[PDB]
């Protein structure tokens, strides 16, 4: 629990959201409505999501007699367990332990938003906005940069906060691609989990572990048994075949030597296609 005391970063956060006069703002974790009332002026209908009924009672007390009294709903409970209604942009201050859930819940909405202005911890945001080859390019950046696009707005330094915390914060505009692209989710995530375990060792390193070859052997068997094509002779268990299979891909697409924390998104696509082409899937 911290309070954005600065009355001038609040206005800038709001008007960068480009609220149209026909929008449904979701506004997650409203606080004491230092920020909300601007959104009430600029949006047709606000849906604030809150967990502290003390704050909810005070916030709904704030709007009484005000002309905007009827354009605000409040949904209580845990944010990560509600059903959000349709909402059309999203503005968020919520305490940072939900910073990584929140993002993927917005990306995996049915009819996702169009723009969202989110507040994050500085190092978290700098994971999100890190291009291939930087020091901070992580697995999170490769996911989120596949399905969204993430752009810095400003630095919120730590002395605009009551009480002052220790970490610096950032304001970040996130905007979902539309249509979301037609690669799978679970195949994309399986591949990124494997190849980003050790970010700066080469890619063929990540396909040496014996947990991983067990996983891929199991998947390849279950794929053949999905198509009912009975199995040949393997010198160990089936991974034998898989082993040379993997090596062959890492010969052709050349990627078995580049280091996964320097390979941008088209390279992961080419690797995903090459494993799909020879009968490997990741979930």
């Amino acid at each position: 629990q911290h309070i954005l005391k600065n009355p001038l970063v609040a206005q800038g956060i709001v008007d960068k959201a480009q609220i149209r006069p026909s929008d449904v703002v979701l506004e997650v974790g409203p606080g004491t409505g230092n920020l909300t009332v601007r959104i009430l002026e600029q949006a047709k209908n606000v849906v604030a999501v809150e967990m502290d009924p003390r704050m909810a009672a005070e916030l709904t007390k704030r709007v009484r007699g005000t002309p905007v009294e009827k354009k605000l709903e409040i949904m209580l409970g845990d944010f990560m367990k509600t059903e959000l209604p349709y909402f059309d942009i999203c503005i968020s201050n919520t305490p940072y332990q939900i910073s990584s859930p929140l993002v993927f819940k917005l990306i995996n909405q049915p009819r996702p938003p169009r723009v969202s202005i989110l507040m994050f911890q500085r190092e978290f945001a700098l994971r999100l906005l890190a291009r291939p080859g930087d020091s901070l390019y992580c697995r999170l950046s490769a996911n989120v940069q596949m399905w969204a696009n993430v752009t810095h707005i400003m630095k919120v330094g730590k002395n605009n906060f009551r009480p002052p915390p220790q970490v610096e914060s950032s304001v970040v505009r996130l905007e979902i691609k539309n249509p979301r692209p037609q690669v799978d989710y679970n195949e994309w995530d399986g591949l990124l989990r494997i190849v980003f375990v050790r970010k700066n060792r080469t890619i063929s390193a990540g396909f040496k572990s014996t947990t991983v070859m067990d996983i891929l052997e199991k998947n390849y068997k279950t794929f053949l048994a999905m198509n009912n094509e009975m199995v040949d002779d393997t010198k160990g268990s089936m991974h034998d075949v898989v082993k040379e299979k993997i090596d062959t891909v890492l010969k052709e697409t050349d990627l078995g030597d580049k280091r996964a924390g320097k390979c941008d998104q088209n390279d992961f696509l080419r690797l995903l296609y090459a494993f799909h082409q020879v009968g490997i899937h990741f979930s």
């Binding site: 037609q182 998104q265 696509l269 296609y273 082409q277």
Partner: peptide, 15 residues
């Protein structure tokens, strides 16, 4: 961007 789009079509092939 062009390269990306052609490969995503070829991945539609092997779903």
């Amino acid at each position: 961007r062009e390269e990306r789009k052609t490969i995503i079509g070829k991945l539609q092939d092997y779903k």
